[PDB]
């Protein structure tokens, strides 16, 4: 009786949200950006090839200096690369080789990683002993760790396969906030430029916008037909893009609270593993399972270019803070730095 | 044209390669096994004979190091983290023979054996395990002989029309799982009959892994 009445009210609320979104859908992003000129063909060449990983590379993250990056591979090593000279600055042996994510602190003093061990390990890169040591192990997730991002030297947000995202206090080792509401495994998260909000994509084909300070869900975004594997914030923080298993990338707007554009092609039938934006946000770079990375025109939904240099699935990619270069990792155990030429 | 400090950074990087190379060669001489199987199917009993989220177990048998990984605590969606084990030497799958006339505790309508067959077919035919040999264990064979005397196999397999004996019913179940192999070219299935007091379980895995090692060597050497 009471349970039946409540679930009927939920459907009415869902219908109310859908009607509100349809009311504000006066125009389309494709119609708005129909007048602008296309970006043409985006030609990027492999400037560097980072060799040394002996297994599949699952994650990489740029440092804020746009020169150092950390990559995680399932050979049990967390390697820090000097992308300018291909020198390995550090090599961090991981206790669990099933690492699924890695992060670089914006200060550059710490790196994070985590996988099937349900632990977010924090490593101190700046020690008087001259070696990288484990500073914290964040326990409390009951599923595998899928993504993690530093806010500062003391705060870090992690997503897990237990359908929850957690905000951690690194000094005390306790999660101050837990972000619940997903019904499936959360696969990735992206911090806003001001680090006051973050978006996450889960296996329930939904994306949620979270308030870091308050600890509650603000907006929920739907539309994907399968599990969301990648998510990234737009440079201004007012939009984000998701990459799912249905071979589609979609752009959502926080203020419009609805999808604006879909980035898919008929020849593309494989899943999408990683998405990222260029510095201006005009280029949406997405890694796919077909061993290639496609560059998308975010405003016009055109495939501007292809980064085809990997012998296996492109599992991760990232663009530098200055937009100068883009790195792609892959299951062929190679990281490639791409940028164009005049 | 490197500075005095750039040259020392390069030497440090090559020293890191000297340690990645040392660790990588040591890792390639070890065996990684993925232990799968439904609950109460003898999966935990196998660990008891071959002594967080993922439970990793090491054991040494005839100068060969095995790393067996148990992911039974991962209640998340299997298809998301299953590709992380693409490249393991072999998969040890445990199926309870005695769990053919029984039903699942939660569903209370789906047979336990059918659950394993669906689980086995989801693993054997998985795209990430295209060329990954599977070690199929048919545990509790002694208890199966008792049940087949009282409960006929026709409860689980209506199409079964064989004798009510262990020597014929057990082989029928073994063929059903091997029949689920949608790709009988890129992979093989090793079937073994275990028990609670069997001392030949670790030997079978050693033999099956040896065959996988030979197959991998043929591919690397270019013979395959």
């Amino acid at each position: 009786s009471e349970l039946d009445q409540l679930r009927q009210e939920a459907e009415q609320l869902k219908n109310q949200i859908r009607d509100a979104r349809k009311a504000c859908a006066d125009a389309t992003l494709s119609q708005i950006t129909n007048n602008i000129d296309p970006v043409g063909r985006i030609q990027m060449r492999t400037r560097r090839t980072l060799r040394g990983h002996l297994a599949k590379i699952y994650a990489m993250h740029w440092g804020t200096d746009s020169r150092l990056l950390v990559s995680a591979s399932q050979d049990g090593k967390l390697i820090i690369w000097d992308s300018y000279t291909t020198n390995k600055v550090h090599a961090i042996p991981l206790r669990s080789s099933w690492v699924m994510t890695c992060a670089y602190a914006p200060s550059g003093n710490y790196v994070a990683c985590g996988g099937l061990d349900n632990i977010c390990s924090i490593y101190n890169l700046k020690t008087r002993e001259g070696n990288v040591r484990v500073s914290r192990e964040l326990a409390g997730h009951t599923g595998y760790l899928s993504c993690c991002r530093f806010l500062d030297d003391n705060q870090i947000v992690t997503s897990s396969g237990d359908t929850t995202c957690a905000l951690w206090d690194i000094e005390t080792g306790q999660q101050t906030t837990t972000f619940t509401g997903h019904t499936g495994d959360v696969m990735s998260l992206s911090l806003a430029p001001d680090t006051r909000l973050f978006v996450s994509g889960a296996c329930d084909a939904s994306a949620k916008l979270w308030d870091v300070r308050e600890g509650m869900c603000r907006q929920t975004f739907t539309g994907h037909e399968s599990d969301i594997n990648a998510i990234c914030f737009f440079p201004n923080g007012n939009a984000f893009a998701t990459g799912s298993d249905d071979a589609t990338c979609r752009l959502f707007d926080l203020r419009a609270d609805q999808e604006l554009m879909t980035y898919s092609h008929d020849n593309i039938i494989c899943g999408i593993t990683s998405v990222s934006f260029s510095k201006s946000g005009r280029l949406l770079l997405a890694g796919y399972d077909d061993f290639n990375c496609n560059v998308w025109d975010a405003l016009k939904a055109d495939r501007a270019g292809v980064l085809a240099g990997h012998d296996n699935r492109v599992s991760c990619l990232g663009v530098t803070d200055d937009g100068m270069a883009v790195a792609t990792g892959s299951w062929d155990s190679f990281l490639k730095i791409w940028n164009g030429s005049s | 044209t490197l500075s005095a400090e750039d040259k020392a950074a390069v030497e440090r990087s090559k020293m890191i390669d000297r340690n990645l190379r040392e660790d990588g060669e040591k890792a390639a001489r070890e065996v990684k096994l993925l232990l799968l199987g439904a609950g109460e199917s003898g999966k935990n009993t196998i660990v008891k004979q071959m002594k967080t989220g993922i439970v990793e177990t090491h054991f040494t048998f005839k100068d060969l190091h095995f790393k067996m990984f148990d992911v039974g605590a991962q209640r998340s969606e299997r298809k998301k983290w299953i590709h992380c084990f693409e490249g393991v030497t072999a998969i040890i799958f445990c199926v309870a023979l005695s769990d053919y006339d029984l039903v699942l505790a939660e569903d209370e309508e789906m047979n336990r054996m059918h659950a394993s067959m669906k689980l086995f077919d989801s693993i054997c035919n998985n795209k990430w395990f295209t060329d990954t040999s599977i070690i199929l264990f048919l545990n509790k064979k002694d208890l199966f002989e008792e049940k087949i005397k009282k409960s006929p196999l026709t409860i689980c397999y209506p199409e079964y029309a064989g004798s009510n004996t262990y020597e014929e019913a057990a082989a029928y179940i073994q063929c059903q799982f091997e029949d689920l192999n949608k790709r009988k070219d890129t992979k093989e299935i090793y079937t073994h009959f275990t028990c609670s007091t069997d001392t030949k379980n670790v030997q079978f895995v050693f033999d099956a892994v040896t065959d996988v090692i030979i197959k991998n060597n043929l591919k690397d050497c270019g013979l395959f």
Partner: single-chain antibody
Amino acid sequence: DVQLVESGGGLVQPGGSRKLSCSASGFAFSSFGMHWVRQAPEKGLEWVAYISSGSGTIYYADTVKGRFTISRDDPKNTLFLQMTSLRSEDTAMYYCVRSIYYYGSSPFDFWGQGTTLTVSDIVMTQATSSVPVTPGESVSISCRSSKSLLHSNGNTYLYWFLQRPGQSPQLLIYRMSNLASGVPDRFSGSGSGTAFTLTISRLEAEDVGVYYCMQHLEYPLTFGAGTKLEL
């Protein structure tokens, strides 16, 4: 804690041999390159030898090349300087210096307490030998080099060291601009090309000492004459 204790120094006869040892504790001795730097009595610092991490690279000073030998024992965390045919010019206090080299690192960050041995090329110039100073007053220290220390990669390999009376040299500024860890922010390094300046805003009593500028652009490493601040 990081520690470097030198031993083996003492009075030796001319033409003899002596063995210097440097025991390292509290840090990854095998991950650091190690230097020997001596200082003649009432004189400035003088680099002696260098051995890299893994013993792959060894450098010597021309004034001691062929007679001095530097080696390390990573399992025992000990650094060695084998010296043969000692001259009267070798009478100095020898210091053990660690320096790790990667992107963003600070070489020469920790120096040993040194040992005393008594026997019976880019030019760095510090013309100003002494500067009368008072507490709370901003002081500028000038250094010059024969060749431009700015490399094509953007780095300017100039190092600043402060040796307080009775203490070992301590790194203040590395690569001419970066402030070493544990050094107050009032110290700042500024320069361009061949002329450099060390600025000490709001000078305190602890800042009293001799300031040395070193070059790391190429070997041999050369020190300046030294600028002494006195009250």
